[PDB]
Design a protein around this ligand. Sequence first.
Ligand SMILES: [Co+2]
Ligand SMILES: [Co+2]
Length: 9
Amino acid sequence: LAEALHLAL
Ligand SMILES: [Co+2]
Ligand SMILES: [Co+2]
C-alpha cells in the first residue's frame, strides 16, 4: 500500500 499510494500521489 505504502508504495502504491506514493506512486499515485
Ligand atoms: Co519504495
Ligand atoms: Co518513489
